[PDB]
Ligand binder design. Structure first.
Ligand code: HEM
Ligand code: DA1
Length: 291
């Protein structure tokens, strides 16, 4: 099962920078969403969930085919809430109808990370929409009520190692859990629409108490009003994860560089890029363009 990247006909860096810019401008404009968190976090989660269906064993799922647009995947219980991200991107797709769905969803996540002052994430075009019957069944995205061994084994299916898993999880500084979406409630820190290494600092420095929420699920709560999922907290229960948590808590630049690599890899799993494919694009932020 081979998915070969195919550049949208005649398109180049400038075309994709325009799509970036439209996403970034709408991120700025539609600022009220989710009690003024804005759409950044949900777009990052959308990019991850459309990628996280991948299975290295047979190359099913993954970002390439854009299959989130089909009802089976759109209505995955694991994807509850992501409809808000898709609705955000609808006017973008209308303005730029030539971009593939997988390119749009993945570019949304890259744009969100960068516009929230995160690391640059190199991004490659050429995902191609595939038919409805290529949509992966529900149940490939991870549960949150589990322990470190679960997390480790889960991410092996995505070809991610301990350092890549701990780096990716730093995205949980962003946005919040919403009780009605996932059965968990609250943010992981204070700056939840700015991309920082706060997730690791909060894991190490807050006083965490294991409580039940209003959906009768356990989660870890701090008196500052932050929360951790059981799978988040597992990163300080397992000694191998804990060492990497401490590394990223103590080195912002290292976290940014490792996140950027892991997130690009996540968004590109399953895709074969021709030797003659364009190099990865690194988009300028609005701020860098004076826009
Ligand atoms: C063991 C792996 C993970 C689990 C179990 C997990 C679980 C969750 C859950 C339950 C939520 C709350 C959804 C809702 O109520 O709205 C959430 C939110 C989020 N997740 Fe994860 N996640 C995992 C990994 C990741 C990864 C790898 C990324 C991306 C690099 C990521 C990005 C996000 C973001 C940005 C949000 C906030 C969304 C919002 O505010 O709307 N997650 N995750
Ligand atoms: N989205 C999110 C926020 C906080 C935590 N701990 N996990 C996930």
């Amino acid at each position: 099962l081979v998915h070969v990247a195919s550049v949208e006909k005649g398109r180049s860096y400038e075309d994709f920078q325009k799509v970036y810019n439209a996403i970034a401008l709408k991120l700025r404009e539609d600022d009220e969403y989710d009690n003024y968190i804005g759409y950044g976090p949900v777009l990052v989660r959308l990019a991850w969930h459309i990628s996280g269906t991948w299975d290295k064993h047979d190359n099913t799922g993954g970002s390439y085919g854009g299959t989130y647009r089909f009802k089976k995947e759109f209505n995955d219980p694991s994807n509850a809430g992501l409809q808000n991200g898709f609705k955000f991107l609808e006017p973008i797709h209308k303005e730029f109808p030539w971009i593939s769905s997988g390119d749009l969803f993945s570019l949304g996540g890259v744009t969100a990370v960068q516009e929230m002052q995160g690391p640059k994430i190199p991004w490659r075009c050429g995902r191609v929409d595939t038919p409805e019957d290529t949509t992966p069944d529900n149940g490939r995205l991870p549960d949150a009520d589990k322990d470190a061994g679960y997390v480790r084994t889960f991410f092996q299916r995505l070809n991610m190692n301990d350092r890549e898993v701990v780096a990716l999880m730093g995205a949980h500084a962003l946005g919040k859990t919403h009780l009605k979406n996932s059965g968990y409630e609250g943010p992981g820190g204070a700056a939840n629409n700015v991309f920082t290494n706060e997730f690791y600092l909060n894991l190490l420095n807050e006083d965490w108490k294991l409580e039940k929420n209003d959906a009768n699920n356990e989660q870890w709560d701090s008196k500052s009003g932050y929360m951790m999922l059981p799978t988040d907290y597992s990163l300080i229960q397992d000694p191998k994860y804990l060492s990497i948590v401490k590394e990223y808590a103590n080195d912002q630049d290292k976290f940014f560089k490792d996140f950027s690599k892991a997130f690009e890899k996540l968004l590109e799993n399953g895709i074969t890029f021709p030797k003659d494919a364009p190099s990865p694009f690194i988009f300028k932020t609005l701020e860098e363009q004076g826009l």
